[PDB]
Design a binder for this molecule. Structure first.
Ligand SMILES: Nc1ncnc2c1ncn2[C@@H]1O[C@H](COP(=O)(O)OP(=O)(O)OP(O)(O)=S)[C@@H](O)[C@H]1O
Ligand SMILES: [Mg+2]
Length: 211
């Protein structure tokens, strides 16, 4: 297991998200679905000139899986996935140019929904989750698990769980006061409100394709 420090301003942002009250937390799901859709675009376009990139799975889609027993909400996609370098670089150690400006915007009264436009949308997960685990598999790399409960660091380790063909699984360990995001009707209303025009199928467990 390898431990990494979040870049200083990313750590500051995560603390701000965790310790300051914001309404409109529901946009976390929009941000994660957008990341899945971006990842699905990437593998789709790559496959146009190299169809073998889909040997690890041809279906391009997103699954939403609430688990009330475990208090988790999982967002799974069959997008391009992340290499180990991708996880380390893109999910915490490299500075984002918009982080400081976003925190200044929040202090001035901006809605938390603006988080994606500032280039730090992933961290919206911490509005509702005490811990986030990201399991990911990219072609020509092994499967990895990234994990953080905030506090300034994350870990990365080779994953020996259920093999994915290709893509990313974001597992949100929800805070005790945010279990509304495990409810069927709640998930449907948020998807309808915020993710209506995503260009890949979205399926809610346990069985239902959302249109
Ligand atoms: N499901 C995923 N599959 C592959 N890569 C991902 C996934 N989720 C996040 N990432 C990576 O994490 C990076 C950071 O995600 P975000 O913080 O949402 O920022 P961003 O999506 O690059 O910027 P936007 O368009 O303003 S939300 C992405 O650019 C991807 O490289
Ligand atoms: Mg994003």
């Amino acid at each position: 297991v390898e431990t990494f420090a979040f870049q200083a301003e990313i750590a500051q942002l995560m603390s701000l998200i965790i310790n300051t009250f914001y309404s409109n937390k529901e946009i976390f799901l929009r941000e994660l679905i957008s990341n899945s859709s971006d990842a699905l675009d990437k593998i789709r376009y790559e496959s146009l000139t190299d169809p073998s990139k889909l040997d690890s799975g041809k279906e391009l889609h997103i699954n939403l899986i609430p688990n009330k027993q475990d208090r988790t909400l999982t967002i799974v996609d069959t997008g391009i996935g992340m290499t180990k370098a991708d996880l380390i670089n893109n999910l915490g150690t490299i500075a984002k140019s918009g982080t400081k400006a976003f925190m200044e915007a929040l202090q001035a009264g901006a809605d938390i929904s603006m988080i994606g436009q500032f280039g730090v949308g992933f961290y919206s997960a911490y509005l509702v989750a005490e811990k986030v685990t990201v399991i990911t598999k990219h072609n020509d790399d092994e499967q990895y698990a990234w994990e953080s409960s905030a506090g300034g660091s994350f870990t990365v380790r080779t994953d020996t769980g259920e093999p994915m063909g290709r893509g990313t699984k974001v597992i949100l360990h929800l805070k005790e006061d945010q279990t509304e995001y495990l409810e069927e009707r709640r998930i449907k209303e948020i998807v309808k409100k915020h993710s209506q025009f995503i260009g890949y199928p979205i399926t809610l467990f346990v069985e239902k394709e959302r249109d």
